[PDB]
Design a binder for this molecule. Structure first.
Ligand SMILES: *[C@@H]1O[C@H](CO)[C@@H](O)[C@H](O)[C@H]1NC(C)=O
Ligand SMILES: *[C@@H]1O[C@H](CO)[C@@H](O)[C@H](O)[C@H]1NC(C)=O
Ligand SMILES: *[C@@H]1O[C@H](CO)[C@@H](O)[C@H](O)[C@H]1NC(C)=O
Ligand SMILES: [Ca+2]
Ligand SMILES: [Ca+2]
Lengths: 98, 106, 318, 49, 39, 49, 106, 39, 53
C-alpha cells in the first residue's frame, strides 16, 4: 500500500476547523504554534495564533493491479481424470470425472 | 539530533500478564523492568516482528520501547477471583488469588 | 502520438520539495524524491521525484533533458548529466513525467544528483532497497546463461491504463524577494507575469490581492512586517506533503502514471547438477553450489518429513 | 503489520479495508511537511516469512 | 524475451525503450528504430 | 557498556545526571512528626453537630 | 581554506606538489569510504564531511594529470543517536540531545 | 535545531557553514547570508 | 566486491558493462587486513607483475 498524504492546510494568523473525511484509515489532526518556511522566505508573519492542519490516508499501491495475493476458501473438491482406455482394439482418449 | 521514533506496539491485557506485539521498522532495543525489589531486568535488541509475554505484579512493571516515552502498567485481581460459588469452584478460584501458599492452607 | 505521449505534463509543471540533505544541510530542491517502489524482481527501481522530465518547457517530446524548478524560475539540463547511486552508480533506463526507471544495485539509501551551472546538487532519502532474485537461487546479478522463468517486473513502456494519481492546484507560494523598502515603505513587485498576494498583520490596509501594480505600504517600518505570496493558479501539482494547499478551492482530477508493474520473463541461474551416490535405503548427494541455493526434499508417504535448507558451501548430506 | 493489513473485496472494488495504525505527528518548526506513523507493510513481511 | 512489454526489437535484436522509437535519435545504432517511422 | 543503571535500577528508581540523584524510588516508608500548637485547634462548639 | 597569498577563499585547496605548491578548486576533491562522501566545511589542516560507514577512508582529487588518491586504514562506525539503531536520519522524529562536530571555525 | 553550533540560520531557515557567512558567495540562495554583512 | 563493472565515456551516453565474478583477495600473512599497513615486516608473497616481459 501507499500512504496518501494531503497538502498541509496552513492558515496564517488564524485558525482552521477540521471536518470529517471519508477515506480508508483516514486521520486528521490540527497543530498550532507553527511558523512555516519556504524557499522564498517565512510563509507566515505571525508567530502565534497559527494553524497547520495535516491530513493523511491509506490507499492501494499502483502496482497492486499486477502484484497481489488472492485469499480463497475451498471445500467439496472433485477429481477429474484422463484415462486412456482400450477395449477390444478401440483406442480412445477419455476425459471423465471420478 | 533528529532520531526515529519506535513504532507503537499493540498491547493485549490478561491475568497478571501483558502481551506486547512488537513491529519494529529497524533494530530497536526493548528494555523492561519491575518496580519491585527484584527487577529481573531483561533487555533485547529486536529487529524482526515478534510477540512476547511478560508477568506483571501489583508492585508495578515499567515499559520502555525505543525512543517512546516510558510507560508503566500495574496489575490487579483479574479472574476467577473469589466469589461465593458454593461449593467447590471457589477452591480453585482462590488458587489463582494470592498464590505462594493457598494449597498450603488446604 | 496519442495522449499518453502528449501527456498531462502541459497541465502539471514540476515543483520543489524539501530534502533532508542537499550536501551542506537541507534545502527546498526540485530533486526531492517523493516515493520509491522496489517490487520488480529484476532489480529495476521506480523513483517518483518532485520534478518532471521527458518533455521540455514548450511541451515538445525530448527525452534527452530533464526539467527542474530552480527557485523562482524553471531550468532544464540534459538527462545524461543526472546520476544516481545507492551503493554503486545506477544506470538510468527511462523516464516519463514524475517517475524514473533505473537499474540500481542493492543498498540502504538512494542518492540522486546532477550538475547545475554551479556546485553540484545531491539529495539522499532513506528507503530499504532489496530486490528478490528471480527463482529459488539467490543471485546478485543475472547469469550469462540460464533457464527462462516467469517473473514480475516494471515495464518501461509509457503505456498506461490501470494506475492513476490525483493532482491539484498548488497553494500560495511565499516569496520574500518580492518585497523591499524602496525608500522607507514596503514596495512589492507583482512581478511581471505573476499575481502578487500580499496581506499585513498590522493595522491600516491588511488586504492587497494586487494583480499588477507597484504599491507603497505605510505604517510598516521594516519589510519583515509584511508577507507576500506568488500565485500562479494556472497549473496543477502532485498532492505533495511539502507544499501547502490552497484554501479557496482544490481543483483536482485523475491522471495516469507510467512504468506499470507487469508480468514477464527473466533469466535465472541453474543450480549445478549434484553427484548422486546410491546405497541401501539411502541416497548420497554431493552438493557444490555456485551461490546460495535452496535445497528442498520431501517423501511421497503420508509423513513427508519436509526438510529444507539454504546451502552456500559444498557439503554432502545423506 | 500482519498479512492482510490492506484488504479489498475485489480487484476493481473502490471500497477497501485499511488498518495500518496511522498516527499523525507534530511537524518540525519552520518546515512544511506531513509527519506520520505507520506499521510496516504486512504484505512485505509475509512475503519475507 | 526482453523487458516485456515495450522493447521494440531492432534489426540486430537489441531492445530499446519504446519512448525512443521514432524520437529522432539512433538508439539501435543501425537506424532501424528511426526507419519506416510514420509521419 | 551493557545496559545502564537507569534501566536496571530496582524499585522503579529513575536516575538523573548533572546533580547526580535518584528519584521516585518506591521502597520503604518515612516517619513524620507534626508539632502543631493548640492555638490552631478548633472547638467542637464552633463546628456543626 | 586560504590561498597562497593568505586571502579567504574556501573554493580552493592548497597542496604541496613536490618542489612547488599548487592549488585547485575544493569542489574537485572527492572522498569515499563505502560510498561517496559529502564535503561540509574545512579550515587549515582539518576537513569536515558527511561520510557513510566503512572500513577505510579514501581521498582523491584530479591533478593536471592522472588522478591521485590515498587510502588509510581506520575503523569508521558512527553510533546512531538514541536507543534506535538507524543508518540514516529519518524524515520525522523526536528531538534528543547529542554530541556532534561543529563546523564553526570558532 | 541544526548542527549546533555555527549553523547561521538563513531567512528560509536553511543552515550553512559559519565559515560561509559573509564570504562573498550566495549560499542561502536568497542572499540573506551576504546581506547586512559588517565591513 | 561481488562483481566488476567497467565503463568509459564515448562521444555520447557513457557505456558500461558488468560481469559476475567473485573477487576476494587473500591478505598476505596470518593477519587478515583490508588495506596494507603503513608499517610492517617484509614477507614473501605471490603477485601479478605489471612487466610486459
Ligand atoms: C495411450 O495414450 C497415449 C498418449 O495419450 C497414446 O500415444 C497411446 O497411443 C495410447 N495407447 C493406447 C493403447 O491407446
Ligand atoms: C504468550 O505466549 C504464548 C506462546 O508463546 C501465546 O500462546 C499466548 O497467546 C501469549 N499470551 C497472550 C495473552 O497472548
Ligand atoms: C552419509 O554420511 C556419513 C557421515 O556423515 C558418511 O560417512 C557416509 O559416507 C554418507 N553415506 C554415503 C552413502 O556416502
Ligand atoms: Ca530513436
Ligand atoms: Ca556566503
Amino acid at each position: 500500500y501507499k500512504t496518501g498524504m494531503d497538502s498541509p492546510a496552513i492558515k496564517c494568523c488564524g485558525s482552521q476547523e477540521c471536518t470529517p473525511t471519508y477515506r480508508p484509515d483516514e486521520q486528521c489532526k490540527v497543530f498550532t504554534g507553527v511558523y512555516p518556511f519556504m524557499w522564498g522566505g517565512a510563509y507566515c508573519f505571525c508567530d502565534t495564533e497559527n494553524t497547520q492542519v495535516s491530513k493523511a490516508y491509506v490507499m492501494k499501491s499502483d502496482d497492486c493491479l499486477a502484484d497481489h495475493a488472492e485469499a480463497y476458501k475451498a471445500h467439496t473438491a472433485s477429481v477429474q481424470a484422463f484415462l486412456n482406455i482400450t477395449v477390444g482394439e478401440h483406442s480412445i482418449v477419455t476425459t471423465v470425472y471420478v | 539530533c533528529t532520531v526515529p521514533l519506535a513504532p507503537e506496539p499493540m498491547i493485549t491485557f490478561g491475568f497478571r500478564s501483558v502481551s506486547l506485539k512488537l513491529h519494529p521498522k529497524n533494530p530497536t532495543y526493548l528494555i523492561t523492568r519491575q518496580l519491585a525489589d527484584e527487577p529481573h531486568y531483561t533487555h533485547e535488541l529486536i529487529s524482526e516482528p515478534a510477540v512476547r509475554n511478560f508477568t506483571v505484579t501489583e508492585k508495578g512493571w515499567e515499559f520502555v520501547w525505543g525512543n517512546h516515552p516510558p510507560k508503566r502498567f500495574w496489575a490487579q485481581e483479574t479472574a476467577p477471583g473469589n466469589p461465593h460459588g458454593l461449593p467447590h469452584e471457589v477452591i480453585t478460584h482462590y488458587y489463582h488469588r494470592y498464590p505462594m501458599s493457598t494449597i498450603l492452607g488446604l | 502520438s496519442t495522449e499518453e505521449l502528449f501527456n498531462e505534463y502541459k497541465l502539471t509543471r514540476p515543483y520543489m520539495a524539501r530534502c533532508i540533505r542537499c550536501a551542506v544541510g537541507s534545502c527546498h530542491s526540485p530533486i526531492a524524491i517523493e516515493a520509491v517502489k522496489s517490487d520488480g524482481h529484476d532489480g529495476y527501481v521506480r523513483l517518483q521525484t518532485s520534478s518532471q522530465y521527458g518533455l521540455d518547457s514548450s511541451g515538445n517530446l525530448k527525452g534527452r533533458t530533464m526539467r527542474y524548478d530552480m527557485h523562482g524560475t524553471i531550468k532544464e539540463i540534459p538527462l545524461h548529466q543526472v546520476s544516481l547511486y545507492t551503493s554503486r552508480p545506477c544506470h538510468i533506463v527511462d523516464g516519463h513525467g514524475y517517475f524514473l526507471l533505473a537499474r540500481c544495485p542493492a543498498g540502504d539509501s538512494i542518492t540522486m544528483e546532477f550538475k547545475k551551472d554551479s556546485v553540484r546538487h545531491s539529495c539522499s532519502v532513506p528507503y530499504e532497497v532489496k530486490f528478490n532474485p528471480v527463482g529459488r537461487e539467490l543471485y546478485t546479478h543475472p547469469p550469462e546463461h540460464g533457464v527462462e522463468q516467469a517473473c514480475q517486473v516494471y515495464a518501461h513502456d509509457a503505456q498506461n491504463r490501470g494506475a492513476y494519481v490525483e493532482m491539484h492546484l498548488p497553494g500560495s507560494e511565499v516569496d520574500s524577494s518580492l518585497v523591499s523598502l524602496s525608500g522607507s515603505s514596503v514596495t512589492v513587485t507583482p512581478p511581471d507575469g505573476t499575481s502578487a498576494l500580499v496581506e499585513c498583520e498590522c493595522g491600516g490596509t491588511k488586504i492587497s490581492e494586487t494583480i499588477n501594480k507597484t504599491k507603497q505600504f505605510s505604517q510598516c517600518t521594516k519589510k519583515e512586517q509584511c508577507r507576500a505570496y506568488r500565485l500562479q493558479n494556472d497549473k496543477w501539482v502532485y498532492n505533495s506533503d511539502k507544499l501547502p494547499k490552497a484554501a479557496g478551492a482544490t481543483l483536482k482530477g485523475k491522471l495516469h502514471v507510467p512504468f506499470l508493474l507487469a508480468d514477464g520473463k527473466c533469466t535465472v541461474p541453474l543450480a549445478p547438477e549434484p553427484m548422486i551416490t546410491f546405497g541401501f535405503r539411502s541416497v548420497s548427494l554431493k552438493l557444490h553450489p555456485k551461490n546460495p541455493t535452496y535445497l528442498i526434499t520431501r517423501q511421497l508417504a503420508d509423513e513427508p518429513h519436509y526438510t529444507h535448507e539454504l546451502i552456500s558451501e559444498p557439503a554432502v548430506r545423506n | 503489520g500482519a498479512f492482510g493489513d490492506i484488504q479489498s473485496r475485489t480487484v476493481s472494488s473502490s471500497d477497501l479495508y485499511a488498518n495500518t495504525n496511522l498516527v499523525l505527528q507534530r511537524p518540525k518548526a519552520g518546515a512544511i511537511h506531513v509527519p506520520y506513523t505507520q506499521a510496516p507493510s504486512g504484505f512485505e513481511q509475509w512475503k519475507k516469512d | 524475451e526482453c523487458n516485456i512489454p515495450g522493447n521494440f526489437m531492432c534489426s540486430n535484436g537489441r531492445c530499446i525503450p519504446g519512448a525512443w522509437q521514432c524520437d529522432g535519435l539512433p538508439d539501435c545504432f543501425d537506424k532501424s528504430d528511426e526507419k519506416e517511422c510514420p509521419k | 557498556k551493557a545496559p545502564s543503571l537507569k534501566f536496571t535500577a530496582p524499585f522503579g528508581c529513575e536516575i538523573y545526571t548533572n546533580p547526580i540523584r535518584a528519584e521516585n524510588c518506591a521502597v520503604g516508608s518515612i516517619p513524620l512528626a507534626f508539632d502543631i500548637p493548640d492555638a490552631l485547634f478548633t472547638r467542637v462548639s464552633e463546628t456543626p453537630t
